[PDB]
Amino acid sequence: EIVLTQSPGILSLSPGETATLFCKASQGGNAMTWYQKRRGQVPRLLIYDTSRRASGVPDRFVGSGSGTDFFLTINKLDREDFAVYYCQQFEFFGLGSELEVHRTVAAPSVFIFPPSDEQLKSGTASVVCLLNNFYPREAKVQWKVDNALQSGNSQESVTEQDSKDSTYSLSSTLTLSKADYEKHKVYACEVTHQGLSSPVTKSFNRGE
């Protein structure tokens, strides 16, 4: 079988710049195919036979390579070019490289939301921490309950990169039983992010 290894995993660049994406095959001598997949859209063939552009593909997409090393070059990046790109040879595929929009670092605004009494009435407590409008996407959110770090009991979700301001938002949801919730006082989410000179903490005291 052929193993295709794409890099980098994420590429951060601005409109107008040129992106270079790499695909290394475990076997040499075959031609390379590339696809574009914009978020939520059908995949689109870009390049076949290593360097030939598919139907309706603009000339700023340039495929090249030889042996085991293959490249997709995207000149003068357009807003639409920010997408995930996959390489293929025969039935084998790379795991994809994401091209994302670079912009200035932006610290998240952080908010914490205690669970509602109505949800508590039902036996479960959801505590939510919102990190709004930040860049880059990488952030560390730590839940602490009475200063004990919580792990394995929260789930995160992240928005798609905003099409206009290139920021992300993230939510982390700590889920506890009502009995567990009511045994502790201080609930806090600590956020660590490049845009912050030191970690930011938002918290509340249960029933206060």
């Binding site: 059908v42 995949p43 063939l45 293929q88 949800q119 709004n132 789930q155 928005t159 938002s169 509340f204």
Partner: protein, 227 residues
């Protein structure tokens, strides 16, 4: 223009089989192979197999053999005889088979090989789960106070996807983030929708999130106010 149109998304129970159709038109159906490929969350693309419509000869990915069957039907319309339908049936489904399935076809140029797929069906989402259809509970994420405040709605414990969320019946859109749903360990989905607004307005403006879950025929209007 070549067109590949697939059958709609479906929810399947583990142990089930799913049969997906791909109506192909705009070219001579007998002249080109159709492939099937699946895009699996967190795992990427997996080629499933191909079928050649003339004799309906097939080739299945070694790792899927025994679970996949491809067949085709050729148009029986005398004044429109060149289109056809390709079918793929996938059996013994597990949650790991939850994916988006595509039928695809090669380009028709001289240097086009068999695997560069110029034409794609719109995809068919297959969710494999033992969960029962269930509408969401909606809970408030209440604003805690010039500055800007955040508020939202927690849409919890529904199946299957999707739920749609608007605010104030669509009149409020600026600053709304409705997060991708997460699958909880219970097998049920959950998401939040949040919005940032002026702290100044918290006493003057009303905020209502409108939640619609069509699979359960569930509609909820949740008014969210300061705690």
């Amino acid at each position: 223009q070549v067109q590949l149109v697939q059958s709609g998304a479906v929810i399947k129970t583990p142990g089930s089989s799913v049969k997906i159709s791909c109506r192909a038109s705009g070219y001579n159906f007998r002249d080109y192979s159709i492939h099937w490929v699946r895009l699996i969350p967190d795992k990427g693309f997996e080629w499933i197999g191909w079928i050649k419509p003339l004799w309906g000869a097939v080739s299945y990915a070694r790792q899927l053999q025994g679970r996949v069957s491809m067949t085709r039907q050729l148009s029986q319309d005398p004044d429109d005889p060149d289109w056809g339908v390709a079918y793929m049936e996938f059996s013994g489904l597990t949650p790991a088979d939850t994916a988006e399935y595509f039928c695809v076809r090669r380009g028709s140029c001289d240097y086009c090989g068999d695997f560069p797929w110029q034409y794609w069906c719109q995809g068919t989402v297959v969710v494999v789960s033992s969960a029962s259809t269930k509408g969401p509970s909606v809970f408030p994420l209440a604003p805690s106070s010039g500055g800007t405040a955040a508020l939202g709605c927690l849409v919890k414990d529904y199946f299957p996807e999707p739920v749609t969320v608007s605010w104030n019946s669509g009149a409020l859109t600026s600053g709304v983030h409705t997060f991708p749903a997460v699958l909880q360990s219970s097998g049920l989905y959950s998401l939040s929708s949040v919005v940032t607004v002026p702290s100044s307005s918290l006493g003057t403006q009303t905020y209502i999130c409108n939640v619609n879950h069509k699979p359960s025929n569930t509609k909820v209007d949740k008014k969210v106010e300061p705690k």
